[PDB]
Every structure is written in C-alpha cells, then in structure tokens.
Chains A and B, each alone.
Chain A
Amino acid sequence: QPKK
C-alpha cells in the first residue's frame, strides 16, 4: 500500500 502507498506509504508516506
């Protein structure tokens, strides 16, 4: 999942 796209993560900061």
Chain B
Amino acid sequence: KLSLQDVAELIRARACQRVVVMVGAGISTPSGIPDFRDLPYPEAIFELPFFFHNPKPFFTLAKELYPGNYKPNVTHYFLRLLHDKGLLLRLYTQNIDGLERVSGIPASKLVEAHGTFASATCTVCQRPFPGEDIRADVMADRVPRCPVCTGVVKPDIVFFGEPLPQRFLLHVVDFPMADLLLILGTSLEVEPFASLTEAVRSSVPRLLINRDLVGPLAWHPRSRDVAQLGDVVHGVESLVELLGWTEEMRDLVQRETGKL
C-alpha cells in the first residue's frame, strides 16, 4: 500500500500537480474553533424555519465565528503553500469560519460549500450587504435588521435544505481532474459534500489526515488510500517534513502574521 512518504514524493516530484482538497471543522480546531463532532436540537442552528422563529442562536454562533475573531493555523497555511507552489486545483471547504481566504488563498481556488460570513442578504427584500455592514450588531449581540424593509439580515451561510453555492458544481470537473485528493479534518457526515470522496478516479491517491477513518474511506477503501490518523496539525507537520517544506512554511507563516 501507499505510505505518507509515497504521497509526499508524488507531490515533491510534481507527479501530482492537480491536488483537490476537502476540509472540515477539524482543520479549524487548532485555531480555537470547536468542531461539531432555546435550541431544540443542534441542527436547528442551520434551519431556516427555526431561524425565522428565533435567529438569536445562529447569531451567537455568527458572533463567535465572525472573520477577524480567529487566525488561520498551519493547516491553512500548508494549503496556501500548496497553492503558492501551483499544485492546488481546488480547495473545498465545509467550514464557514472563512479561514481559507484569510490565509490568502484566492477565491478562484476556493469552494466554500456552506457559504460565507463575508456577505449577507436581507431575508425579506433580498438586498445584499457586505458582512462588514452587520458586524457592529452581530458583535454587539444585536440581530441586524435591513434598512429597507426591517427584515432580518442573514449572513450568506447555506442552511439545511437550501441550494449549495453555484461554485459547488465545480466538483463535476474538479474531482475527475484531480491527481491527488487530500481530505483533512472532516467527519464526512454532511452530504452532499461528503460523497465527493468517491468522485476522483479509481487510480487517484486519497490521503486522509484526520482523527479517525471516516466515511467511504472506511467502508469502501481503494487501493491507493493513505490514512494519517491523529491530530491534523501533527499530520500536516509530518507531511511538510516529508515534503521538505518546513523552511518554506516558516517563511510563509512569518509573512502572513502581519495581515492578521
């Protein structure tokens, strides 16, 4: 079977230079954002009917999560280095913390499958707003209201049962184009984002860096799956060492600190 070593060599030799990446909340727990894995059940927080009933739970999360609150960690910066080396085809994220773009990965490389706090939309009149526009209220524990119609202004977070963003559809071209799939810090429980793991070609290495073997990687392993189980930062640290990128990662991380 393939090892982590083997995958690192594939990258370092540019045998794989169209890497697709899937990430989840696991990659942002090092940043200090807890993962998942009145509020009547957890899922309520992303349910539109509940939100209309009581938007205060969501907004408490939005306040916790709002850009500026958290800094990207070495996992993000690794993915940024992947981009910088011109190896990243696309990074698909279930996260709504926005730490991918804060790390400096261009929006063309990102698919933010569950939406963004960078923008907002009035729930009544559909007026769009910059996320900065509602920041004061959200942070001041107010529910932001539309100037035009008084309707609740809701971040462009994709709620359960709502259409995934346009850019999600990129998966039809991305996954079959990928010569490596990297899966980081996802339980792969959330469809339809999960089953994307199956959408790379039979020949394509799939590298999981996660606490645990999850999803189709567990039940339906393929010949060239690699599992690096443990802390995600330890995993990436290990990958970066094998890649010989440690000095490049320092340089990058040092440069990027200022922005934050």
Contacts and interface: CB of A to CB of B under 8 A. Distances in A.
A2 B168 CA distance: 8
Interface residues of A, number: 4
B114 interface: yes
A3 B168 contact: no
Contact of B159 (A1, A2, A4): A4
B169 A4 contact: no
Contacts of A4: 46, 113-114, 158-164, 190-192
A3 B46 CA distance: 13
Interface residues of B, number: 15
Contacts of B114: 4
Mostly, the A contact residues are loop
Nearest to B113: A4
Contacts of A2: 163-164, 168-169, 192
A1 to B, nearest CB: 4
A3 B161 contact: yes
Interface in B137-189: 158-164, 168-169
Interface of A: 1-4
Which 4 pairs across A and B sit closest by C-beta, in order of nearness? A1-B163, A2-B164, A4-B158, A3-B163
24 contacts: A1-B163, A1-B164, A2-B163, A2-B164, A2-B168, A2-B169, A2-B192, A3-B161, A3-B162, A3-B163, A3-B164, A4-B46, A4-B113, A4-B114, A4-B158, A4-B159, A4-B160, A4-B161, A4-B162, A4-B163, A4-B164, A4-B190, A4-B191, A4-B192
